[PDB]
Design a protein around this ligand. Structure first.
Ligand SMILES: C=C1CCCC2=NC[C@H](C)[C@@H](C)C[C@@]23CCC([C@@H]2C[C@H](C)C(=O)O2)=C(C)[C@@H]3/C=C(\C)[C@@H](O)C[C@@H]2CC[C@@]3(CC[C@@]4(O[C@@H](CC[C@@]4(C)O)C1)O3)O2
Ligand SMILES: C=C1CCCC2=NC[C@H](C)[C@@H](C)C[C@@]23CCC([C@@H]2C[C@H](C)C(=O)O2)=C(C)[C@@H]3/C=C(\C)[C@@H](O)C[C@@H]2CC[C@@]3(CC[C@@]4(O[C@@H](CC[C@@]4(C)O)C1)O3)O2
Ligand SMILES: C=C1CCCC2=NC[C@H](C)[C@@H](C)C[C@@]23CCC([C@@H]2C[C@H](C)C(=O)O2)=C(C)[C@@H]3/C=C(\C)[C@@H](O)C[C@@H]2CC[C@@]3(CC[C@@]4(O[C@@H](CC[C@@]4(C)O)C1)O3)O2
Ligand SMILES: C=C1CCCC2=NC[C@H](C)[C@@H](C)C[C@@]23CCC([C@@H]2C[C@H](C)C(=O)O2)=C(C)[C@@H]3/C=C(\C)[C@@H](O)C[C@@H]2CC[C@@]3(CC[C@@]4(O[C@@H](CC[C@@]4(C)O)C1)O3)O2
Ligand SMILES: C=C1CCCC2=NC[C@H](C)[C@@H](C)C[C@@]23CCC([C@@H]2C[C@H](C)C(=O)O2)=C(C)[C@@H]3/C=C(\C)[C@@H](O)C[C@@H]2CC[C@@]3(CC[C@@]4(O[C@@H](CC[C@@]4(C)O)C1)O3)O2
Lengths: 208, 212, 211, 209, 212
């Protein structure tokens, strides 16, 4: 009754009484940490050169305007909110061939220090030539993820590790993973001074 | 026509629960919520051995109880229950953990609410999931499994339960391409090294073969 | 001179939706009779590899509410109007053995008449559980699918038919499948747990390949 | 400057300061003219008897509540409005087998005489037996269009011509058109006094040489 | 800490543009709008020779400039640009004239508004359009065209422009099933015999063959 009431006031205080977050700027840049858990390569189509992945995409960011003291809110350390109610980063695959499909409830975890955890399970079709998938060496494909409309001066993309998490990879998949990495890259365009950041998902795989 | 206010009793109750009283914010560590899950498997529609995807049609029965949805029937003209759209109330975020396509809803998104604050929600769903159908064309059949759980709440917040570990097969389609050899729904508690909380799932395991 | 009749309709619509409380749904104390019927237009596809059959049909739903009654005399002799089916309560009639979500072919609009009647006839495409074995035989294949409220008992929503004959008079003459018979039959059950009756309408179709 | 401002004032006046048209009635019937531009026959499926067409469906009607004198609003003669913000006619294919797919932005054109022009590009699957499509005589198929919920006492459906517009039919289509007509038909049902109108699109087509 | 001021600055800017003074209501004959259109071709995914449809992935670049979106950076803590959801602003109704399926959008629907009042919006899209792939498996390839333009505005209302007649091929997928022989984007002034006013489109001509 008290625990339940304190949360209704907390969400209210952050979401109603406080004017919300309009996004990162040059003066107030934002670090977004990114990491992948690869669950299944579902299909590799050699007549269109599309491959279908199911993965979990972990997204982590921190905000002052989502900080609070648990002492003023009944020891409440964390809460759940719909991703629609808050700002989320516009991380996008740069070479998908169909719109991403979301497999999970679009819900994020907000902790008292202002950090936000958002992990949507997704199915992506993307550009990939599976030539060699039927051999010892397998095939190698790559896809880039990054912000659609922010430079590296507004959203800094970062990984916690270069190793894609394969500890939940489906053991009875048509395809087995020889290796899977996630590398931060800095890209410039000749028009412009800003750096642009993406994370390169490289997967090497073969028929099992 | 003066039962008109049994309609108005239903209108009043709905105000007193939704409009007068604050939003149910979901469960917390101090205010945990038991959710009972059960499955009625209606059909294995397709088994795709080129992608290792199998498609099921089932009813997913969900049931939880909230104090904030309780009322005295005598205070509302002896009304036992009502219906609301699932959009208009909090519902548990139960998710298959190995789906390959977004879940497709086959039934109207309506929940039943009872005077003791109990809520019943039974969406019919079509699900594609990760499954190797090898051996479906033999006596022994294929065995496949899919885990269901909350996406964002631990066992400290959502106490996921079952009433029985036997999947309800009594309205399983008699002319399905696939006959069911067995269907179990097993609750599983897991602990990780990082974290104090238990993590609960319900494992749905189906042994099945091509109808002979 | 037709500025006034437009005004009367605006006034009527307002009086029923804005100035009165809307219909909250049926109860045990205030039950609702819903009449159901089917117009079978086409059997599109019969998949013997997954045991699904695809139908296009019109689903006639009719019910009456006191809260939607008016005197035509009070509103420039207007006897009916049209409304979007999302602005009003509609019954939760569902196919009990569909395999994919229903696809709506028609504009979601209902007809409301001055005696409180609502007429709602969506055109739909349905995939449902069906074994078409014998479809090229003389006897044909036989398939069945039940329709009823998802969340209301017989004591709350009473399902009714006007006829057991499915309307076959617009059945597509050059379909892949000819209809040998199509019936719609109200059935009643009681479950072991409870005293309430449960109603469904059984759409039974016998069909075979057109030669 | 000025031009924008006059546009905003006009749309306000029609949409906010005047009550909008609530739909046609028996006492206030409405003429809708309908016409087709056939772009392409994409697919003929003989295992299900379905054909897919792409076409432009031209719809036109005229409303007193959308008239204005151009001198009253800085010489503005027309504007555009999302089709969701105005009443539009419920014209449906009577024999589609899948929900019709919209290909163009849902924007209508309103002119000072109160006439509305709405031309959605659409992909349609409808019931059609393509037998004989590979012979010289071709296959013949037909689909009816009409209001779903209004009789001919409420919406008077008309055409401007019975000849379908073939001037932008895809020149490299899998199928060539032999003829395409659109014909107004008036029915009567024993149940009721009102007349019922539809427009019947009849297409004769065959595989290209 | 002074990041609170730039956040406050941004919010007042957005507030002053979206709350004080309404929509730009669209272009008129008296106030016509220039829209600059460009294409980044990324992939020819498939060429169905059974239906004569071809599927493209590309980035469509759209530029326009409005006085109603213009500001002095000095009054807003030197903010020179921001991001908006494309829904919260007017955008041009640029359509493919010969699509066979609704365009599918692959990127988030966000635009970039700069202080000079110019808006930049670049949707990634997958398009199915009318194309005959005959000759694709020969050395000289197949050629297909699709026109893009406004659906409801004449050239007196929207002036469609390009910066170059060469499609950007620098991000074209190197392992596609199809290689690009050439890709041009040409601004065309059409005359319809009903009407004196001109109509503008951008014609995307792609010459391609099997890699394969
Ligand atoms: C919406 C857009 C770009 C969408 C396409 C795109 N977005 C992600 C990033 C921002 C860029 C560099 C790569 C992309 C996404 C992936 C790719 C390619 C595809 C391939 C897999 C790859 O790695 O890069 C391109 C070409 C896009 C880049 C442009 C389009 C580029 O021409 C945009 C230029 C670069 C610099 C600039 C000037 C102004 C600015 O405009 C862009 C957004 C940021 C902003 C405001 O600084 C406008 O960026 O405009
Ligand atoms: C949104 C998420 C995780 C979603 C993915 C996920 N969810 C269900 C449960 C919580 C976990 C264990 C399984 C999953 C869904 C199913 C699986 C795998 C897939 C396979 C079928 C299986 O059995 O487990 C994983 C790997 C997810 C787990 C993570 C991702 C995991 O690394 C998250 C860790 C575990 C403990 C913790 C610390 C904080 C916390 O963060 C998560 C939510 C609960 C919360 C607040 O306690 C954040 O959870 O963060
Ligand atoms: C949301 C639901 C049930 C949806 C599933 C369902 N609905 C239609 C009716 C209500 C039932 C009998 C059949 C169904 C839909 C069709 C079928 C099967 C499938 C096959 C095609 C068929 O004909 O019957 C089942 C198994 C459902 C029934 C249950 C699930 C059943 O266990 C529910 C029991 C029966 C009576 C009762 C007690 C309380 C109550 O709860 C249900 C709603 C009515 C209500 C308040 O009386 C809760 O219903 O709870
Ligand atoms: C929503 C509906 C019917 C939808 C189905 C339908 N609609 C378009 C028109 C109105 C009718 C005649 C043809 C249809 C759509 C096309 C067809 C068939 C299909 C084939 C391709 C064809 O050409 O006609 C039918 C069978 C529908 C007709 C009925 C269903 C019919 O039984 C309905 C009767 C006819 C007269 C009447 C009485 C009252 C009234 O009710 C209808 C709406 C108008 C209204 C108020 O006058 C209720 O219409 O109700
Ligand atoms: C919404 C529409 C037409 C949509 C179809 C269409 N739109 C883009 C442009 C405007 C036209 C010329 C080409 C189109 C889209 C592309 C094509 C074809 C398809 C092929 C790839 C091609 O190159 O042209 C046509 C035939 C459309 C044209 C008509 C439909 C045309 O008959 C409409 C006439 C032409 C001039 C006029 C008079 C009034 C006016 O009405 C139109 C809108 C502008 C407006 C107000 O000036 C009404 O335009 O109406």
């Amino acid at each position: 009754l008290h625990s339940q009431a304190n949360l209704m006031r907390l969400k209210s205080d952050l979401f109603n009484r406080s004017p919300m977050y309009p996004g990162p700027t040059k003066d107030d840049p934002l670090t977004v940490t990114l990491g992948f858990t690869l669950q299944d390569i579902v299909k590799a189509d050699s007549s269109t050169n599309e491959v279908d992945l199911v993965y979990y995409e972990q997204q982590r960011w921190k905000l002052n305007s989502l900080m609070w003291d648990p002492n003023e809110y009944g020891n409440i350390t964390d809460f759940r909110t719909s991703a629609a109610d808050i700002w989320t980063p516009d991380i996008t695959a740069y070479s998908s061939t169909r719109p991403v499909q979301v497999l999970s409830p679009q819900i994020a975890v907000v902790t008292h220090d202002g950090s936000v955890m958002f992990i949507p399970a997704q199915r992506l079709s993307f550009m990939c030539d599976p030539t060699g998938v039927d051999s010892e060496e397998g095939a190698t494909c790559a896809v880039k993820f990054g912000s659609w409309v922010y430079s590296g001066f507004e959203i800094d993309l970062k990984t916690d590790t270069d190793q894609v998490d394969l500890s939940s990879y489906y053991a009875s998949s048509k395809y087995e993973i020889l290796s899977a990495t996630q590398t931060r890259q800095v890209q410039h365009y000749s028009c412009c001074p800003e750096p642009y950041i993406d994370v390169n998902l490289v997967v090497k795989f073969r028929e099992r």
